[PDB]
Amino acid sequence: YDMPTEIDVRADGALRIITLNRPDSLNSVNDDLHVGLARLWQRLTDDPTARAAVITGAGRAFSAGGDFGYLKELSADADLRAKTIRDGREIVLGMARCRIPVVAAVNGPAVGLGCSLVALSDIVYIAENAYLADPHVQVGLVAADGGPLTWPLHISLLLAKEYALTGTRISAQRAVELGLANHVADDPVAEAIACAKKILELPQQAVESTKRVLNIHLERAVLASLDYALSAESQSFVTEDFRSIVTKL
Amino acid sequence: YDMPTEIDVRADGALRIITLNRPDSLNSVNDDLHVGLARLWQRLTDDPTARAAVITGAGRAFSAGGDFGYLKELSADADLRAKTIRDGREIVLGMARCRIPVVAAVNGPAVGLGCSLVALSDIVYIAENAYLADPHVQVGLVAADGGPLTWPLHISLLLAKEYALTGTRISAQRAVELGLANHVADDPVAEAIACAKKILELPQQAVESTKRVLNIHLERAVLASLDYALSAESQSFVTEDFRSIVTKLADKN
Amino acid sequence: VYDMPTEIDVRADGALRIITLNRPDSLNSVNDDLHVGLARLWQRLTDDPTARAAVITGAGRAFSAGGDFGYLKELSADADLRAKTIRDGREIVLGMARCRIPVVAAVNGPAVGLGCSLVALSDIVYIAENAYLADPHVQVGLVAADGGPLTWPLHISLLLAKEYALTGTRISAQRAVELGLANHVADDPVAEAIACAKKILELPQQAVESTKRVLNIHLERAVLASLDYALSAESQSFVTEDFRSIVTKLADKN
Amino acid sequence: VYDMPTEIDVRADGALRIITLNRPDSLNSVNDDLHVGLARLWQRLTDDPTARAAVITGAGRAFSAGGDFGYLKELSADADLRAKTIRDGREIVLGMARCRIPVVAAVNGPAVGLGCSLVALSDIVYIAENAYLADPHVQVGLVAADGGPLTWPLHISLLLAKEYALTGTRISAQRAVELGLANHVADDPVAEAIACAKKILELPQQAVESTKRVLNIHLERAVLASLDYALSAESQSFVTEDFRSIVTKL
Amino acid sequence: VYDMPTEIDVRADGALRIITLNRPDSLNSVNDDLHVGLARLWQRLTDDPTARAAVITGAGRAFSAGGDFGYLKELSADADLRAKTIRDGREIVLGMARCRIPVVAAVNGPAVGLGCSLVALSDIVYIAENAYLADPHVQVGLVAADGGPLTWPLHISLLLAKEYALTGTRISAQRAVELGLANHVADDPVAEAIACAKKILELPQQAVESTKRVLNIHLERAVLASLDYALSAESQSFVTEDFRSIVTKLAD
Amino acid sequence: YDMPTEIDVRADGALRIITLNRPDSLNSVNDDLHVGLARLWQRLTDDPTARAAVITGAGRAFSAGGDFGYLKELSADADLRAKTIRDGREIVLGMARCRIPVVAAVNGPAVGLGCSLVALSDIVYIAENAYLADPHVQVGLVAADGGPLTWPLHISLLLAKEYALTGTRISAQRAVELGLANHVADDPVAEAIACAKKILELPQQAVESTKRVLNIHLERAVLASLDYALSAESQSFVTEDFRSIVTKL
Ligand SMILES: [Ca+2]
Ligand SMILES: [Ca+2]
Ligand SMILES: [Ca+2]
Ligand SMILES: [Ca+2]
Ligand SMILES: [Ca+2]
Ligand SMILES: [Ca+2]
Ligand SMILES: [Ca+2]
Ligand SMILES: [Ca+2]
Ligand SMILES: [Cl-]
Ligand SMILES: [Cl-]
Secondary structure, X not given: OOOOOOEEEEEEOOEEEEEEOOHHHOOOEOHHHHHHHHHHHHHHHHOOOOOEEEEEEOOXXXXXXXXXXXXXXXXXXXXXXXXXXXXXXXXXXXXHHOOOOEEEEEOOOEEOHHHHHHHOOOEEEEEOOOEEEOOOHHHOOXXXXXXXXXXXXXXXXXXXXXXXXXXXXXXXXXXXHHOOOOEEEOOHHHHHHHHHHHHHOOOHHHHHHHHHHHHHHHHHHHHHHHHHHHHHHHHHHOOHHHHHHHHHO | OOOOOOEEEEEEOOEEEEEEOOHHHOOOEOHHHHHHHHHHHHHHHHOOOOOEEEEEEOOOOOEOOEOHHHHHHHHHOHHHHHHHHHHHHHHHHHHHOOOOOEEEEEOOOEEOHHHHHHHOOOEEEEEOOXXXXXXXXXXXXXXXXXXXXXXXXOOOHHHHHHHHHHOOOEEHHHHHXXXXXXXXXXXXXXXXXXXXXXXXXXXXXXXXXXXHHHHHHHHHHHHHHHHHHHHHHHHHOOOHHHHHHHHHHHOOO | OOXXXXXXXXXXXXXXXEEEEOOHHHOXXXXXXXXXXXXXXXXXXXXXXXXXXEEEEEOOOOOEOOEOHHHHHHHOOOHHHXXXXXXXXXXXXXXXXHOOOOEEEEEOOOEEOHHHHHHHOOOEEEEEOOXXXXXXXXXXXXXXOOOHHHHHHHOOOHHHHHHHHHHOXXXXXXXXXXXXXXXXXXXXXXXXXXXXXXXXXXXXXXHHHHHHHHHHHHHHHHHHHHHHHHHHHHHHHHOOHHHHHHHHHHHOOO | OOOOOOOEEEEEEOOEEEEEEOOHHHOOOEOHHHHHHHHHHHHXXXXXXXXXXXEEEEOOOOOXXXXXXXXXXXXXXXXXXHHHHHHHHHHHHHHHHHOOOOEEEEEOOOEEOHHHXXXXXXXXXXXXXXXXXXXXXXXXXXXXXXXXXXXXXXXXXHHHHHHHHHXXXXXXXXHHHHHOOOOEEEOOHHHHHHHHHHHHHOOOHHHHHHXXXXXXXXXXXXXXXXXXXXXXXXXXXXXXXXXXXXXHHO | OOOOOXXXXXXXXXXXXXXXXXXXXXXXXXXXXHHHHHHHHHHHHHOOOOOOEEEEEEOOOOOEEOEOHXXXXXXXXXXXXXXXXXXXXXXXXXXXXXXXXXXXXXXXXXXXXXXHHHHHOOOEEEEEOOOEEEOOOHHHOOOOOOOOOOOHHHOOOHHHHHHHHHHOOOEEHHHHHHHOOOOEEEOOHHHHHHHHHHHHHHOOHHHHHHHHHHHHHHHHHHHHHHHHHHXXXXXXHHOOHHHXXXXXXXXX | OOOOOOEEEEEEOOEEEEEEOOHHHOOOEOHHHHHHHHXXXXXXXXXXXXXXXXXXXXXXXXXXXXXXXXXXXXXXXXXXXXXXXXXXXXXXXXXXXXXXXEEEEEOOOEEOHHHHHHHHOOEEEEEOOOEEEOOXXXXXXXXXXXXXXXXXXXXXXXXXXXXXXXXXXXXXXXXXXXXXXXXXXXXXXXXXXXXXXXXXXXXXXXXXXXXXXXXXXXXXXXXXXXXXXXXXXXXXXXXXXXXXXXXXO
């Protein structure tokens, strides 16, 4: 798929396994990983030999959120900021529109973008000790990357607002209770792969159209709020509140 | 309301009891049951002597889904196909816009369309051992009849995706917890009747307009996706995948 | 500073505003003044930059018991007042949906009718152990237009919204939190809501206010689809024999 | 034919249906029976596979002069007839918006009030040289709810729709065509709309029917946004003194 | 007046209100005081039961020649004023959209930028023979977010709304009526608008006000869809070096 | 931009000239031109050095629509059909979301997909004796390319309905009278290039943000009906009506 180092795509028949691949840095999102995720979904859509994906992270985390270095660049580099905003748009719309089922295997913390990738998936398996969180607000940023943007399709709006506003950690058990996750698994990668291979035996036209039927609701909610969210996040990158916090850490 | 035998309608004052009536086939859907459902909602809306309904199934099930013979005919006959699509649309739009409250008494399995009727009701009572399921995808069909379509109004979209794609049976308890049903009942038809009867004592104009206020959301969601959904299921009927799954399922010697 | 009447006390504590529904003797029931004040408050908070967060609660044992029977009787008899209350009813919903600052509810006691709609329109909700939510509009001959059943489908299953709205069932604190109609049960909801708002106040402003906005776009889209219909239908129920007859019994206080 | 009343004549001519509003002594003003007919018709057309296209027109000199004053005074005095008429008005609008077959309008004379709404809901419109469109709801103390102004923004500037709905301006045949409220000025709108429909009849059915649905999605979204409120507000009109007073004189 | 600043005169003539932008020396260009008054007024019109129709026009030669340059210059430097002018910008748009009474514009001279937006947001528009409409936002480094181009798609072709919001080209009185941006060309548009509003005053209140809401539902939907994005972007525009450059030149 | 031969892209500073390139065939649409078109718009969005585009056709026509051999192929080939549908969607979604202003130089007939691309552009110049037309229906296909689908944003729904159903040729003068085009031109290509050039001088963030504000209204329309529309054009590739008409052509 012409991915970079930080995104390993492996082929097993009509399955694709996607592994976020910065395990030493807990899959924190740098420019390279970000651009990779922007491009990947349309590519899956356009490859007829792919019929399903699994997304997971290498090592202990799914993704711990933004890379501090990447973040500090974003607050001083306008060209980089404009590109990240385009790509950000393409991840959300890439996954919203993606042809094939995507099964998430949350092996570890999924924070920020990680947490948004999980809300944009079709079925989610999560490890007992893993959690979801979005700490955008606590760090000085509008949560635009897809988490809070998509959470009201999954949970109550009250709950969405509280977790977006305060960076609440959502445990594996709680996420399943809420419908932010489908199953707690001991081995979420394995359980994910078996659910995707199960889906691969089903009639293709039926599988692909039914995902599109449901994702229309997702796409409606995205077109309503995404341009404003991205625009506002862009303004937050240049706030003293953000610049200060992202310098300390 | 000029229903065919497979939809029994009983009046009890201002109440209508709607019983799906092919009990020996687990009330599975044939053309007559389908057509009747398509016409029924508008005729209730226009009968000012009706102000509430209960819908249930005769015998052990609420509805086991499509009659395999009906489904096989649908893969072969383009005219019948186009008809079923029109009538399917009318069931969904018909319920969405139905003037009177509709209380489901799910007496056993509500599968495929049955499960969609339950999603389009206002209040659901469900028996302890009944379940909800939509096995459209397992069988080669796009789930358009109104279940998965409207499930996201009741439940997490992630959970709607999973159940639409895997055809999981949803127990009465799991359903009540999820908000796909309202109460578990020893006698769901008795409890539905009582529920509807309380609603009949209440001021009509408040009851009717308040349903309308809440169903606008349902209508907004259906308008976004029903046409596409129906067109896709129209194509599903003609696929080799579906022909081969249904030609086995309909082969009964 | 916000030209509120007696029936809405508003208190400043730094950048926090504490809003108290203030008719304790009537269990904070809605009369015209309380309705007008609620209509005008939210824009005035948005425009006060010294304000950055708000807590809303009730004086005495109740959050709000809903409609003042005297007022409701007057509404079934006065077409001018009716048209005004519809206008102000749109402003409460629109004002809260569009309000710049996070609003945390402290449901100290029953939140009924307009009461529970103010709750459904808040951002974070703390509820007392013995408090409950209810909307008895339909039992009383009125369409539930206030913002309750109107907004409920964004928190809970539509099936459940249809039941609770058609029957007026009471939703206990434990049940509300189980359902997503509230965030937390509290021994002391006012203290807990105040601490929650004060914790938010420490967060970067532009991030908090923008994030409320992103989330409330979904709420505004839902309100815009049904609000004018809902309020127009409620207008009509004030003039029904059903309501006129029910509200005459209720407004009969010797 | 379709169990219509006398007030609505439906004629078949192969796969075409010709719908003629039928109270020419009253300029096809709308009474209850015509109104109920209009609500039932479209779903029945939709459900008749031997029907593939419609033309709609008026008997005699008018297309339709709008609201029969007898009906309207009756509507102002009886809550149950109000509730039924709102219910049916809803069905006319959704009926035509959801209708399977192409509907071609032949506007033979004035199309006023509801009649002008029938035109806006049609797919192609031929209008006689001397004919006009108007919606007089407001000047009569009624909210303009039953499809006209409600639908006009899909045809014309919102500014123009607002002015015409508030002032009840007459829109001439030429002027209708200049705005896109009508497709062609016709000497014989009945005949020209009949040939239009026969032309569409020869085209591939599935292409024709699906294309209508594609464009009417935009119509349906605009209606769904506003119809419930407009009908509710018009129900309130029937009951005001301003209306009771104006309709008494008329 | 209605607590308007001097920059907005409101005169009462029975149930009628005449709203007059009142900085003729600067051709009614938009400063901060005018902007605030425009934000506050609409809700106050809606809440005054003794008002039932309104006309809006400009003192002197122009209806309004868009932003005061001095004002736009502050907006490039003061962040608090920026956030405030964005808040009130929403209120002009949402307040006009939701306003109870019909509003009839008398475009007596050029309506530029915000002026052109107030016209788009009106119910019925009368325009002088030598007047015109324009939005030069883009030529000046600003996103056109005030409610002009935001709203133009409900009146005209999207292709045309794009041409004019991009090129900033002027729309003559005659061309505006032809497109659907104006209702009537007038010799004396103040007088034609006043007469139009008076006719409307004679009509049954409930029918007028409801019919306005029915139609404005479409404007409200179009605004909700793009306003928050639009104002956020125009906000980013104010801090751009393109705008700082352009505006510093124009105010010196 | 890795574009096929059938789509020429030329650079002139920040300008991109897009010339549809099958002149001997009146730039009629085959699979490769179709794939090129689907892939183009995101690549333009992502090339920061492109800031405006002009689209036109080589030779005497803008585009005469579907390639007959291509359409016959589509009637008989399941996979080719599903692919053309995916790409058709990207053409529409790519144009609607394209960052940069696109100016159309309609140099001759723009028929079918031709007038759909015109409909999706932001400013249009049309030559004196050119016309817009969509004959999808008369050949047996639901008019889903984006033409009729976009028209109600430009013109009365009544006229859209008529032009779509009857395949009416819309003259250059009528197109401008309705606002299906902006100007009649002696040399549409020069006037377009000059207009695009004028735009390139304007402040970029104002230009690009303003396009987005406006195209949100386009994107709302497209999202409401595109999937139904593309699914119905798929069903019509498979009708006897279409097969007969295409085969005898
Ligand atoms: Ca982010
Ligand atoms: Ca039978
Ligand atoms: Ca039979
Ligand atoms: Ca089915
Ligand atoms: Ca109320
Ligand atoms: Ca009427
Ligand atoms: Ca501006
Ligand atoms: Ca095509
Ligand atoms: Cl495989
Ligand atoms: Cl919408």
